[model samples]
Target chain A: EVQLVESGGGVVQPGRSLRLSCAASGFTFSSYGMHWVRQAPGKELEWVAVISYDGSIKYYADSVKGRFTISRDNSKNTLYLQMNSLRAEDTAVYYCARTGEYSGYDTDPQYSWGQGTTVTVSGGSASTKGPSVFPLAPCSESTAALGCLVKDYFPEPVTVSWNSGALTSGVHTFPAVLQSSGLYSLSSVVTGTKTYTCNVDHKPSNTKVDKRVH
Target chain B: EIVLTQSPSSLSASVGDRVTITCRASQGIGDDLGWYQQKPGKAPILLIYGTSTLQSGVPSRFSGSGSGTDFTLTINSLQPEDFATYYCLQDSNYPLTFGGGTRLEIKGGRTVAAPSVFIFPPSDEQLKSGTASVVCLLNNFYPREAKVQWKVDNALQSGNSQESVTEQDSKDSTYSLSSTLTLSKADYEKHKVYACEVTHQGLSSPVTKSFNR
Candidate 1:
């Protein structure tokens, strides 16, 4: 029998991005591909994408680009899916699966599934200005302005933070309104050699197969 | 994404037998299971899902309930209508997954207790034309619930007639019926297939007869 378990919890300010993982066991990793799916709270299932076992090929849904990428590491028999610019609609339960090829121009059945994980983004204090690292891209024509935008459309309150050498004060806010997407968005501005981070309050969940309890 | 499997590929039971089907997931799939029923010529109908929650408008005798990795589908006091095939599915996962079906058949006797046909003699005037009326007979069926329709070429015909059975004897659950169809002189020589369709809870397919006049 095949088995899968998902990483629990994720946090993101408005305009920032996050990544989650679905790990598998008790089956040959190279023999099957991993697929991603979404299920909103109390709703039908939606198919997202599939990542090949070798990590070279990926098939994504048409509307899932610019903010999401499906990937995997064959060495650890684990699969990874990254979602950038986390929004309220992206907070639903996500699942991964194994499937076969469609020989006659038809979609085949999914062979396996991962226990789903839930993510939440709530209100928190974040730094608007502080010591920063090199910018991920060319922003403000400055190499030391490592500031990134984080956004969420969830109904819960959200916060954004910035860092350089250590945590700074007077650059954070709280009690923001939830956007139409159900998540609030915020930005963490920083400068210097420090790393920038976005964290949200979320619940954790996971599953295991073939556990022998003596 | 969830893999589902069904047990007991075939079951033999009488009219009031209680049938059960079990579905197991390779791993814990939570409450994402659904069930369906399929007959020979018709599309499958959704039966139960979410491991126990009944779909809208489904019969009450059909019930399902389970959690985590194990699930069960139980049909109480199996009616004739429940003699078809059953399947289990997982909707909580993506791309969907289905289980192989379980077929319920009649027990003890292989024969289906079919009806017989009684052909009338050719009349004197019909001898000149070399054709006569054919009377098809049916027996050992529930007349009140059972329906008899004539088919000329897979299409329904209306020239047939039958007599009604009394109520006290109707409780016997087995009654006989018949239908008569007229054949023409030239049409009798040509190859033709005449069939009688009997419909009841236990059986729905048309039982047929072929004749060359």
Candidate 2:
């Protein structure tokens, strides 16, 4: 019964520095390993770094190796990630995960996760533009079920929602994903013949667009 | 780095059948091996870890065994929802790597058919130019394990050909695949034939569909 709580995330400007913290409880903090994971708004989960509880060894993801520093305070029973030269791309939800395995292992898969903290990096050339919603592809033969694709948005954090005429069974909506180009896209699937609507909302731009399927 | 290679790549199993998938490592991984199951459009869930230990709350039907370089994940009784992709991860060394993945699909009980291969001609605009693109579509395949090859004038093609990831049709769970080849219009004008060759384990012989200008 181990628990991890993440904190110290909010709004920061580009080129600035930020430090996030993860507090652990309900287990021997010095015995197991703690790691950091992040999820950009509408994107897949990415591993950031990992630190041994004794504060001896640390590893960072290849992409963020030089930019992010992972450290742990054994006395405080807490782990920290100090990131320098933040960018808009760094605006993401940070999470602290626990691995039951001890420190010596080079690779430890996360066993449990913490409630994520949303970090927004603003100012400094960040785009305030909203995404453009593409035409919804209704479920048809030779293809799969209903799907929608949105592209070319910026400044991190976008929300997409699905609205069928009346909620029914077998309706599934996938999480929004950030593409390599830094834009967001999402799609959904449902059964039966019913019209659907897709809505894209961007907080920074204060923009929202809704497109309905025919 | 420990490299893991999975066998059979993909297979079909029926409900209540016992299925075993193997993962071979290049070097000893000890008990630092883990198994993950990923369904379509979803994140992967850990099933087995530390070689033989089942993860918390995992079903008893799924089990893992073996150590060092050889490991196997056995599902005693398969269920409909168990049809997905399984991957093996090695955490014994730095820079963990996963096996290519093995896809398990529901076996066709009564209606099993070989894939229907269709070779579409290049567009007219493409035909006018010296460079053209042709498409080969394979549909209605069960088991979802098929190898597609491209040939021009009976010669195996190595370049300028690409294949899309196999997509499973949610309606009936059959698989579909599309491969495209870029060729020269001059070759078609010279009566060079473009062919798509498909081979499935269930089929007796390779199926070849050809198209010409």
Candidate 3:
């Protein structure tokens, strides 16, 4: 019956800082430990930090070790995450998860998770006002057959589409994501041919960018 | 890090069967071991914690014991709804880890029938976009827990398939399952064949239904 809610996300400038909070209820706040997880746009889930009921903390990902701080206030039944020197990659949805039994010791796996808070870190003056489409390339060993990278968009909400001639075998489209540096990047994978095109529509600029490979 | 290894990764049992599943750890975990039951499509529920301490309201038939690196979860008398996967977790160390898992499947006792299988082809709207969803439904089977698979043409498909969690009928204790596979309309049109295969412990071979468009 435990529930967690996350809030405090919008936009942060590069070299700036921001703090996010997680409010917990339905169970004893001091009885269990809380962990932070983040999912970057079009990326796998990443473990950030874990905070015990006693206020001890552990950072799992090295990238956030010193850059991010996780703390808790038993009085408020809340957990907090503060990040400084933010980068574009820090743009992601942050979630707070709880683990173990009521004792707060290691008794169980993460059993409850909070809804994510989306945070965007905009690049200072170098931010791209519109979308910039990158060249198509063979995706990494872990991804789909091919990949298309689109970068540097503004505001929120962008779309990326993949077209392979007429009708392709299978298409996997990863929606556009706003990075921590305040810009946007998106990628997609297709199972079929080498000849394909990527189209990006950024609402803020009211423009579209299309790149094709033959 | 305490590593936990579960033995007899999977087994078949019947209602009223006495079952014991074991979990062995690389090092002593004291009394910090917990047992969990995970039914398909649902989050795992804690059954036993702190070794033999049963969780609140868990059935007395589900019991746990042992200490140090050796632990066991025992079901005194299995019920029709007891068929599922069980796991052991150790909380004594940093980076908590769990045993692989042990699946309890139906074997004997009451005579159970194989599920009636059916396939539903994608709608025209789905096919118009070059992608379609094909659904396979397995209905009216006893003791639940069926292995469902999909195949495109004759080759076994490995991806883009979603299987619903098994559903049980409270009155008859019967079970049903649904699985959906998504593929390109081009591939479906070219081969014109898709198959859903269901395998239950009650049946020797799998029950399959093929859909052609």
Candidate 4:
């Protein structure tokens, strides 16, 4: 009874940043390490990186050692792949896999696969950004409500989600505000508690930016 | 990546014999090792994982020992059903290499044999009204598949409209089955022969055992 599900794939510019996501279930998320394996078109598989089970240490392949970031949010059972200075050669289908306790960094097998996320880094400047959340005077008074801001992002459509220590409903997302910089901005007000997060999934720009507000 | 070498590539064992197999890895692998068993035409079944933790539903007789670069698969007092090949695998590195295999077979004896059948007279406490309950037991059989029928005076009796099942002995590999049916006390008094007929794949013809009194 173990599983990993990969999400987050998008087209981005050759020089921008991109983030991929994987949500683990069926086992303790923090007890085992997670690894990212990617395969370029018609090429053999490559090990991108691995985050220690406890998320205290990270290891990356020599090629991506200084080019990418691996991080995790144990509370949400999710791990992330944040890559910057992207290039056309970075286009590939990346997979998230689970490793045994103390068994990451080519030290153990990837026991379970969470599927794959195919990333295409053709181009983008159709740019996207912004997930700034500020305390608000409650939406309906009694419950804890907060505000978030997303700006200087692009291509019209973006997916927004709110996280807390959290609520599922009571979100009022304002319409996208077209900015003077030929980009898009969006904001949402969702019920939350302390340690709330705003996740911005903008695939068109190969970016999945997140901001945590305490 | 590591190389694993399993020794005694073959084994010969009998029912109730203690068996052990070994695996040596080229380098350290911690407890990131596992064992599996496979039959000729069936899929491999995981016997143990995390080195020594037994997999769910695997019998107690099957076990794993050792760690790091050396490991062992032990079948304590082996059973007949375990007459198959076993493999050792390492997960601590790439390739996911599997040990060649350690195959076990019944040694210098009948590989498949018929069961020994017996009938037991009704126990004193089992009698009620004018009826007595009698039981037939078939033991030490192989193949696990078999059928049992009750007969009185060379004719099939209908009071056997009951259920009985074959079970494997916990300490031995053979099968045992017992069937109980009620009969008239008059038959018990008359010493009328009650027979238990058993048919098994290992039998050329049905084997029967009769008892009375």
Output the number of the TM-score-best candidate: 2
Q: Model 4: DockQ against the native?
A: 0.04
Estimate every model's Cα lDDT from 0 to 1.
Answer: 0.56, 0.71, 0.71, 0.70
The worst-scoring run of ten residues by lDDT in candidate 3 chain B lies at B164-173
lDDT of 3 by residue, B155-196 (tens): 888767756543344233466655657677877787767788
Candidate 4 regions with alpha-carbon error over 4 angstroms: A100-111, A123-214, B1-213
Clashing residue pairs in candidate 4 are A4-A114, A13-A124, A127-A154, A128-A153
Model 1 Cα lDDT, one tens digit per residue, B1-213: 456889888788999878889989876778878889987557778888778878898889989988988889999998887887888887654446788778777675343444432222223343354543444444444434556676656667674333233221112224444344545556544535556566654455655544433
- Ten contiguous residues with the weakest lDDT in model 2 chain A: A136-145
Model 2: how far is B32 from its true place, Å? 9.3
DockQ of 1: 0.01
Docking class of 4: incorrect
Please give the DockQ score of every candidate, comma-separated: 0.01, 0.13, 0.04, 0.04
lDDT per residue for candidate 2 within B33-56, as digits (tens), equals 999999876777899999889999
True contacts kept of 4: 0.10
The prediction achieving the highest DockQ against the true structure is 2
- Model 2: lDDT of residue B130: 69
Which digits, one per residue and each the tens of the lDDT, describe model 1 over residues A70-164?
Answer: 88887888888887777666667777666433311123332234347766544332312111111111111222322232233333323434332
Q: Is candidate 1 or candidate 4 better by DockQ?
A: 4
